């Protein structure tokens, strides 16, 4: 989860908004799979 | 720990308030069971 | 729906990807707490492709 | 006040406080007044009150790559002695000078100047922290100062109105401070406890009297805080949550405030709902409890079912059902001889509590959630221990109370309610069967047989087992229903015969628990009795029932009228409290009305039960001596004129004349006895 | 017949009294239930009736197996110790509990044709075995 989270947040030209949001999705999904904070942030 | 003393105190006080609500709930429950019985009567 | 599309990539094995992506992203944006084991099966199958 | 040496003057005042603090502790622990009194007067003699000024001075307001130097300032950071995370300026100078010594020749001065900039940076960061720990200890002080200053002094020293005005002004200023956008995040938890403490104080204060603007502004504050809280500081959450629970329990004047408060809590709209829900499903254990409580409370206090609407549409109830499966894991744990976390209990409690506190529209939704159905899957409840017994009870008990509240609030034809409960019982065939075979007259096993019989009563009506054959399961299910009604009958011969004289006897080898247990035995009868009253829809049992009933009926009319006299009018006060001056008098009032109502319930209960035994006997005798083909009816009419002696008739008519004319416009009893004698002659 | 004695037989295995009588009672009831509650009959019985019959046999064999836990365990010394606060009766009860075990045993023995109790039983068995020999 945290891995993909950083992956999405990363300022980088090789990541378009789409793949970002798709990540953040996969994130919340792996999340429901402290962590409550991570959720609140996301 | 004078501070820690206050700490043990307040922690007990919390547990108290919670259980108190638990009681009041059980109580209204029984009262409903009663008004129920009276309805049945 | 995802179980079906999964079986689709299964038979094709034994677009589907982008469709599955649309489904998972839907699951994410959805302003309603789906159940837990729901999310579990969703993420797991989305991976297994 | 040292504008030039902030950190020092701070730490000084801090230690001076701590000393004065241990001093106040001791000086109270023995005695002294005039010094406490003078300091008090100078604190409050109107010129801002002194403690106000004291608090008021403490100001709550406060070449190289960027990320590389930032990581450098983060690696040489160290928590200063008062906890501030200060950037070690000298070690940073050392590291920067070394790396500076490590195109580079002409660039040396640029490197050194950027190093000096990083140095001023680390130094400002240190000094910043130092200021942070300084203000931190400063507020911790002013806090604990108040903590004692209100916590241990006999409230005599302060006129109550002053206490209210001051605790108020304190909440006002502290909220003003915690709310400003520049609030150092770490400073949050401190004021938190402060509020909690200060709050309960004002609570007793105003209650002891028994500006609403102030209580309203207060709740508004504490909410706005709870919102301003990030989703990480679950601590500050649980704190604010408990604080609100109190700020509510502080409250027809009561109904007027209740309305106004409901209106306030609404004005926050769905937000605070979303927060509380989030924590409720997700927070830390302390927050979990305190919240689930707060939810049960708000739900009891709200008519339009709005929060119910949100909780249901937002899917929260499903999160709860999952919580039920989880708590099942927890009890499965405690099944072993060493429970890891007793807390798991208190959780399962607060959860089932918020459940029970959730009227009609809710109950529709809840049964619609199949909550029962989930409970039916549970295998733990089948682990009734063969204190361990006190535990297995404390588990099964709230579960049965749940299933019974279900069969109650679910209208009498949500047949799935029954059938599922019947499945619950059938699952525990051996278990509930034993709980029925229970001979130990312990109050516990008593209450267990009580609820078990109450359920089996409301449930084992034949009308279901025919709608469940939609066969082997229909046969087994109706068989269990039959065995249930069988034991539900046979319990009358135990609790409602002359054998009861044995049960109150062997345990004599305490005033409230008595009226309680009397309500208990009376309800236990009543339950088996209604069970049969449906079921037909040795008779000597029913006769002796009416008999012993009428016996306790005069017993109770008497005991209760005597208690009525007692209520209308040291050892007497001690026993007037031992069941539950001024407050012992309140406790006596309480236990009085309690026993009184318990008795009146026993009275209406015997009276209904009497109408019942009378009706059942009337119909049974009609059948037995009017339409039963044949020696039983001859012996029958004989023993019927034999046992229904004019002694019984006169006692019953005297009873009706005694109490019925105060409660029932109908001499139903007189007509029933007349028809009985008429069927006897 | 047993099913007709449903409440009765259930309490009968459900006895918590070490009354020699109650001992022989559960004993013979269990010898029956062992020779008796075989799956071989619940099949030739067929219908909701046959379901009921298998279910009663199920509660029966289940309790009969549980009986080893009370009669052959470390709890034995407990139920023998609570009675001392008599020789012939002891030879009797020893033969008896031997029979009770061997009975539930043969029950399982056909049934195949917590294991820790099988272990503890092997233990007491061997130890007695020497005491006997």
UniProtKB/TrEMBL annotation, chain A:
Coiled coil: none annotated. It is found in: Nucleus membrane; Nucleus, Nuclear pore complex. Signal peptide: none annotated. Belongs to the non-repetitive/WGA-negative nucleoporin family. Essential component of nuclear pore complex. Could be essessential for embryogenesis. Nucleoporins may be involved both in binding and translocating proteins during nucleocytoplasmic transport. This is Nuclear pore complex protein Nup155. The lineage of its organism: Eukaryota, Metazoa, Chordata, Craniata, Vertebrata.
Automatic annotation (TrEMBL), chain D:
This is MGC83295 protein. Belongs to the NUP186/NUP192/NUP205 family. It is found in: Nucleus.
